[PDB]
Design a protein around this ligand. Structure first.
Ligand SMILES: [Mg+2]
Ligand SMILES: [Mg+2]
Ligand SMILES: [Mg+2]
Ligand SMILES: [Mg+2]
Ligand SMILES: [Mg+2]
Ligand SMILES: [Mg+2]
Ligand SMILES: [Mg+2]
Ligand SMILES: [Mg+2]
Ligand SMILES: [Mg+2]
Ligand SMILES: [Mg+2]
Ligand SMILES: [Mg+2]
Ligand SMILES: [Mg+2]
Ligand SMILES: [Mg+2]
Ligand SMILES: [Mg+2]
Ligand SMILES: [Mg+2]
Ligand SMILES: [Mg+2]
Ligand SMILES: [Mg+2]
Ligand SMILES: [Mg+2]
Ligand SMILES: [Mg+2]
Ligand SMILES: [Mg+2]
Ligand SMILES: [Mg+2]
Ligand SMILES: [Mg+2]
Ligand SMILES: [Mg+2]
Ligand SMILES: [Mg+2]
Ligand SMILES: [Mg+2]
Ligand SMILES: [Mg+2]
Ligand SMILES: [Mg+2]
Ligand SMILES: [Mg+2]
Ligand SMILES: [Mg+2]
Ligand SMILES: [Mg+2]
Ligand SMILES: [Mg+2]
Ligand SMILES: [Mg+2]
Ligand SMILES: [Mg+2]
Ligand SMILES: [Mg+2]
Ligand SMILES: [Mg+2]
Ligand SMILES: [Mg+2]
Ligand SMILES: [Mg+2]
Ligand SMILES: [Mg+2]
Ligand SMILES: [Mg+2]
Ligand SMILES: [Mg+2]
Ligand SMILES: [Mg+2]
Ligand SMILES: [Mg+2]
Ligand SMILES: [Mg+2]
Ligand SMILES: [Mg+2]
Ligand SMILES: [Mg+2]
Ligand SMILES: [Mg+2]
Ligand SMILES: [Mg+2]
Ligand SMILES: [Mg+2]
Ligand SMILES: [Mg+2]
Ligand SMILES: [Mg+2]
Ligand SMILES: [Mg+2]
Ligand SMILES: [Mg+2]
Ligand SMILES: [Mg+2]
Ligand SMILES: [Mg+2]
Ligand SMILES: [Mg+2]
Lengths: 200, 85, 93
RNA sequence: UGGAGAGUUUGAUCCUGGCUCAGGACGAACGCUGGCGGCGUGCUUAACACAUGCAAGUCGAACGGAAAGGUCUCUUCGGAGAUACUCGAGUGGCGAACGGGUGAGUAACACGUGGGUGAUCUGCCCUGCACUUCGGGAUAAGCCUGGGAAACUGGGUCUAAUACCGGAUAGGACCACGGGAUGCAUGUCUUGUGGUGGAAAGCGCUUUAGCGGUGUGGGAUGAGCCCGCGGCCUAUCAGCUUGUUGGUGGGGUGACGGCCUACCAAGGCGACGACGGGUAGCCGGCCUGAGAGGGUGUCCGGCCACACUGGGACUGAGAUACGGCCCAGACUCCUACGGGAGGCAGCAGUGGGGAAUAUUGCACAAUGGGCGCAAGCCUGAUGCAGCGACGCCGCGUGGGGGAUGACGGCCUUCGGGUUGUAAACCUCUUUCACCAUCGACGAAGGUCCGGGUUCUCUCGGAUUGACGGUAGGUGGAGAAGAAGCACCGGCCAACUACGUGCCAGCAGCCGCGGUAAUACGUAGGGUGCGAGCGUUGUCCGGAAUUACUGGGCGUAAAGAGCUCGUAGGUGGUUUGUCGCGUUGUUCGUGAAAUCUCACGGCUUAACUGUGAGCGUGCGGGCGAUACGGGCAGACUAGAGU
């Protein structure tokens, strides 16, 4: 299931502009509601919970799925926060966001859900698939000459492209050089509080 | 019972038990006779009846009415029985 | 009798199979005496493998395979090289 | 590579110390809600009683026979003709001990782990070697009949077989005497001499269609038995044992064995828990935990036990013989009252108990299994399918813009805030659902007919899928059909108003409500989730509150009133040896599945597969002797004289 609701509301609640550009945000930077302006109690559990909600609603990830990802990130050798960010980036809607083939997350996700995407020429419609190394991020051949798919061309310059994926010309196909590690990951959020959370 | 084979199977089982009964009656009466011979210590009829006793015992073993291990057990038993007569 | 039978260890929609040696008077997903191969009939040609040097041992001692295994046994060629046929070679692809 | 705390004893404090809470899990249940799919899963209580259907059958290449089909006929016009493929009823073989269910009983070599069997069995499977040689007499079935209500059964002829009986020869029987090899003692194998002994079978043929059988040596497999270790409560169970402990001679068993028996002696077990009482199927595992532990043994898989209750044998290689037999007992049915039948803890399904867990479905398509030379028949195993959000995973119920920040709602300090880009509106695309259509993999498979040197092989042709016109691809339409649950004083994330006024009521805890309730009911807002959300119950955690890891006993609970002393535990310094503990290495085992790492594929996931760890333990060999332990000593320092 998906949230399917207001976005600037939760941006206000988490006190961080999650999406890229929002005039609805920054006008009322306080959390919404009738008690929107009250001094909240800065509790450790409070900031941890708001931080995990940040991590979820940034990528549109649901609760137990975020659980499962965290329980395999903990099990993977080394650290856990870097790999958790790695895999939640490797979700292909975030891949489209990095490639610049979308304006917002809720339509980056739907461009996958609605079956406008083949990976190795394979029809995928689940937005939770994880891109591997060297893989091709391609589109259906018949998607051409569609309004968003053609406005996707001239809107490829305002947003910087990360160095872990390569986007090419008239064949709008991405090549994933490698699985991005830590730095090229955009960081609207400090990430050790997820790590601390689930030891409770 | 119920199974078409089960009635036939019992009809064979009675045949088996009866034809087996003939044999084990024979060999029981014969081992008793051998004990009669040995207890008396005649050593002539006791010497000459072995040709019948082990004969029918091995017949029993071949037809499988009893099994060769106990067959050997009994024949060794009476062999050592006359070995002290 | 000792059997070389095809034991089912698959899902609802995938019949993966794994070949061993086991006594006939035994259920499928029981204790196999020794594992000697696998068979996945989902790829285009097949996915086939038999150990090919304990299969000879079992066939020599008397482990008779079943009717779906006998075909696969000609395919891997162990039947021909055990029976002295001129087609001793394996013929899989 | 892994450990969180908070509230509560006081006027205040610090300890001690319980209680409560925050987490996770279920074969779950109940409340509300609810779209689908995938994959798992579903009597945890009554091992309570079962209507109804199927779940064990197979061979005409074993034989006597012709009940049906079609035939060579005659010919009544609706009967004869076994000779004849084909085959009803019938005789024999194998199977039925596998397969499935339940967990009552069982505290036990029942189970887990490792060993011994020089003390053993093992049909059909493989391999090595000889033989198939003479015969006989019955009987089914059939036919004529008798009795009985039937269930079933008596009498008289007649006929076979790979059914039965008699034989000849044949070493893996025996006895005795000996050799030759090995030990671990009763003993083991290979032989010789002599004297005794035991086996069988035939069935078909297009004219190189083929099925058999018997005696044995060795494997393979299954099994039997025995043993070390391990695994609940309880002493408010201290004496248990007489075939008990052992021996001899016997019997019996497949086999050792008091397994049984005659005799003889008087032994065996136990405070390291005998005997007894209670509880309980056990396990790989599953839940929890940082681990050690604690709980538990459900799906799967392994082992055991049982099959209405209790007792016993038979056949057969193989028997708790669930759908075999004998008897007793309890329960339901028929009887013509003399007599008989039945056992769902098999697949369903019914009734009954419970809070509660499902279709009286399809296919043998695949695999495993049974039988037949084979085609083929059987398989409620198995593959599936239906129902239960019962659980896990996945995906949707729109997205980008969109202020004059619209109406309405709520609050208000009456200036406004809040719901809120959330809406109206524009614009774009159809995951899922709808209609239409094609359409599967699972089948280098299963049989027939071309060609194949025969075994084999395909050139290459027909036909065969329960799932299922299902999964899946494509076209058409338009945001169109699709969100609810819980909570908001602290733990704990989330607040104002109105209604109520110790009343209703809430609550886990401590507490709230007696006129201004952030704590009851409603509204608004919000938070956490989301096809799920809450309540219960159970268990672990927090609980270092049974403490091995990891606790304490002056006053908080806790030093016996004191001493001696039994078992036990523990033990100074030194020498040499053993190598039991300890420790090193290797070999074997520690099944598969499970858990962890890496890849691979189901659109990702759940799930699966492969390779590597895990399998902590145990057995054998080869090392070591620092410490502990045994032994043979030594010393005086402890101890005693
Ligand atoms: Mg029969
Ligand atoms: Mg008599
Ligand atoms: Mg004896
Ligand atoms: Mg006090
Ligand atoms: Mg107080
Ligand atoms: Mg306390
Ligand atoms: Mg409802
Ligand atoms: Mg499904
Ligand atoms: Mg017939
Ligand atoms: Mg049976
Ligand atoms: Mg059985
Ligand atoms: Mg039960
Ligand atoms: Mg005759
Ligand atoms: Mg003869
Ligand atoms: Mg002779
Ligand atoms: Mg035969
Ligand atoms: Mg006595
Ligand atoms: Mg004795
Ligand atoms: Mg004896
Ligand atoms: Mg019980
Ligand atoms: Mg702990
Ligand atoms: Mg079990
Ligand atoms: Mg069960
Ligand atoms: Mg019953
Ligand atoms: Mg027997
Ligand atoms: Mg029955
Ligand atoms: Mg049932
Ligand atoms: Mg009820
Ligand atoms: Mg079948
Ligand atoms: Mg089969
Ligand atoms: Mg099912
Ligand atoms: Mg479902
Ligand atoms: Mg329900
Ligand atoms: Mg989900
Ligand atoms: Mg479509
Ligand atoms: Mg809070
Ligand atoms: Mg009031
Ligand atoms: Mg309230
Ligand atoms: Mg509770
Ligand atoms: Mg504890
Ligand atoms: Mg507790
Ligand atoms: Mg203490
Ligand atoms: Mg003390
Ligand atoms: Mg005190
Ligand atoms: Mg004192
Ligand atoms: Mg003293
Ligand atoms: Mg003392
Ligand atoms: Mg002492
Ligand atoms: Mg000592
Ligand atoms: Mg010492
Ligand atoms: Mg993959
Ligand atoms: Mg994978
Ligand atoms: Mg696995
Ligand atoms: Mg294992
Ligand atoms: Mg002194």
């Amino acid at each position: 299931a998906r949230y399917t609701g207001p976005v600037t509301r939760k941006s206000r609640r988490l006190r961080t502009d999650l999406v890229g550009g929002d005039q609805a945000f920054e006008k009322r930077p306080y959390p919404p509601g009738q008690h929107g302006r009250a001094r909240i109690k800065e509790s450790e559990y409070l900031l941890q919970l708001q931080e995990k909600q940040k991590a979820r609603f940034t990528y549109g990830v649901m609760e137990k799925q975020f659980r499962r990802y965290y329980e395999e990130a903990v099990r993977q050798p080394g650290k856990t926060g870097e790999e958790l960010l790695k895999i939640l980036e490797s979700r292909l809607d975030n891949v489209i966001y990095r490639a610049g083939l979308a304006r917002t997350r809720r339509m980056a996700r739907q461009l996958v859900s609605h079956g406008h995407f083949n990976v190795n020429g394979v029809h995928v419609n689940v937005p939770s698939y994880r891109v591997s190394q060297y893989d091709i991020v391609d589109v259906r051949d018949k998607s051409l000459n569609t309004v968003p798919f053609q406005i996707a061309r001239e809107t490829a310059g305002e947003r910087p492209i990360p160095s872990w994926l390569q986007v090419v010309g008239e064949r709008q196909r991405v090549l994933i050089h490698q699985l991005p590690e830590r730095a090229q990951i955009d960081v609207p959020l400090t990430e050790q509080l997820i790590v601390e959370y689930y030891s409770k | 019972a119920n199974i078409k084979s089960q009635q036939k199977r019992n009809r064979t089982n009675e045949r088996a038990r009866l034809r087996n009964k003939a044999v084990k009656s024979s060999l029981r009466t014969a081992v008793r006779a051998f004990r009669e011979a040995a207890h008396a210590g005649d050593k002539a009829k006791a010497a000459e009846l072995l040709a019948s006793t082990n004969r029918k015992l091995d017949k029993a073993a071949s037809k499988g009415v009893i099994h060769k291990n106990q067959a050997a057990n009994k024949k060794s038993a009476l062999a050592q029985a006359l070995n002290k007569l | 009798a000792v059997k070389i039978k095809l034991t089912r260890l698959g899902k609802i929609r995938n019949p993966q199979y794994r070949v061993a040696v086991a006594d006939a008077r035994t259920r499928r997903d029981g204790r196999a005496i020794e594992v000697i191969g696998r068979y996945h009939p989902k790829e285009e040609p097949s996915l086939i493998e038999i150990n090919s040097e304990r299969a000879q041992y079992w066939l020599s001692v008397g482990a008779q395979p079943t009717e779906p295994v006998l075909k696969l046994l000609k395919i891997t060629g162990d039947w021909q090289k055990f029976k002295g046929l001129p087609g001793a070679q394996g013929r899989l692809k």
